[PDB]
Structures are given as C-alpha cells and as structure tokens.
Design a protein around this ligand. Sequence first.
Ligand SMILES: C[N+](C)(C)C[C@H](O)CC(=O)O
Length: 280
Amino acid sequence: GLSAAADQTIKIGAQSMSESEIIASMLGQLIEHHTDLKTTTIKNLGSNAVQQQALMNGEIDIAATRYTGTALTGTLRMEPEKDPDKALALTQREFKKRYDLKWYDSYGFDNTYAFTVSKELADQYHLETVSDVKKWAPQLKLGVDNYWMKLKGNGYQDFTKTYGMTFGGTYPMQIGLVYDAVKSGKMDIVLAYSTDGRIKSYGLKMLKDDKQFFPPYDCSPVVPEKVLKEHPELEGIIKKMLGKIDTATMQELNYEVDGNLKEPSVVAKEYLEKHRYFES
Ligand SMILES: C[N+](C)(C)C[C@H](O)CC(=O)O
C-alpha cells in the first residue's frame, strides 16, 4: 500500500565503471541525508541496454549514469545528433514519450570514447587526430573494452567503415585495463573513456575525432515517472546534483578510486563532505 512507500528501499543501478559506482553511491547518500528512505546499489550492470531493461521491469528505481549518445542510437534507434544540447533535448522528449522515464539534465560532464596514445608517441609522430593514425594503423596494436567489437552504431564495425582503417591488432579487455596497457607500451593506442582519472597522470594524449564519428555523451540520471510520483521528495534531491560536476572533477573522483585505491562509497562521501552536500 501507499503508506508503505516511505518504508521501501530505492534501488540505484550502477554500470561496471568506477564512475557509475561513485555517482550511484553519491545519489544514495544524498537521498539518505534528506529523507528516511533506504537506498541500495545494484552493481555490475553490463551496459546501457541492461540499465534500460532494468528500469522498465522494476529491477532498478534509478539509473545513476546514462549517456545521451548511447541511448539515442542504442535505445531509441534514432539518427545521431552532433549537437550536445539538441541530443539531450531529443533524448529527454523521447524517453518521456516512449517509456514514461525522466531523463534528467546532465550532472555536468560528458564521458566519450576517445582514441588515446602516449604523449611520447604523439610527440614523435605528430599525432593530433584520429585520421593522423590512418597511415600507421597496420603497425598499431589497439586495446579496446570488452563490448566495443560487437557494439552497433558507434562500435568497431562502423568505425572501420567511417574512418577507412583497420588496426594491425585489436585487443579487447576490461576497460579499466587499457590505461596501463598503453602506458606500459603493450598497446600503441587504446579506446579510452574521456573521464578516466588516469589519462592525465599517465601522460596520455586523447586524439581529436576529426570525422565526428562519436556522438555527444553527456551523463544524467534516469528515473521512472512512477517512482517520482510515489516518492515526491526524490525530484528535489536529484536536482541538487545537476549541473554541478564538471569533467575535470569527474576525472579527479575516478582517480580516487582507480589511482588512489579508495572505495567508491568513500570517494562519494568525501566529495559530499567537501562540498557540504551541495548546499553550503
Ligand atoms: C561512457 N561511454 C559512452 C564511453 C560508454 C557507455 O557507457 C557504454 C554503455 O553505457 O553501454
């Protein structure tokens, strides 16, 4: 019954990325700061599609981190849109219309796929753009995440068709491993995620996507309208995180987990404390 709503546990989904665990924990702690609601994190969701299904079948009440470009092509099956603001607006409109899901404004950061090399290699061969490695592709070993080879739309197949290059070797691995793979020289180039905290201190260089192959990937929480109706305090709490977390900050938080060996819940807690829970 409705009088039991206050007694329910809010299930917050996290994908298998440090970023998603940090943000899921932050949102849970913020909810507990303001309400008597219990929260839990449903971790290790594999992908955008897994999160989408889990929202529609009640397995998660909030998806902590979704990315506009991924949802536009993968979930909505729409033509890609190059403009970040337009992509977000389209995604918001269609998510409400098709799924009765609220796709919130962004936290303030985007997390894009980015072809990444050591600064040493970039300096030696004057590498600035993806096209700059076209003539080198057969002599390069590329490390990628464990999903990108089969991924539709902005995956390996469409990349080869759009950029007209294939690498001498492709090596799928868990995303977290690619940073050490390129730093150590095992890979010459990797498809990194732009918010990773290791890119800066590992001395890595992200190449410009000069063909604009990759869409915008602004990050937002997504919540079913039914959940918002049953817990009317959630709207105001989620709003407190929006537009407040920039890409440099997200990278720093990711670094705390991956480079400074902190648990995502501790990273989230320390950030909330530093910023006085977003109201000083
Ligand atoms: C963040 N980004 C866009 C690099 C990868 C996506 O999260 C992949 C996914 O969510 O399925």
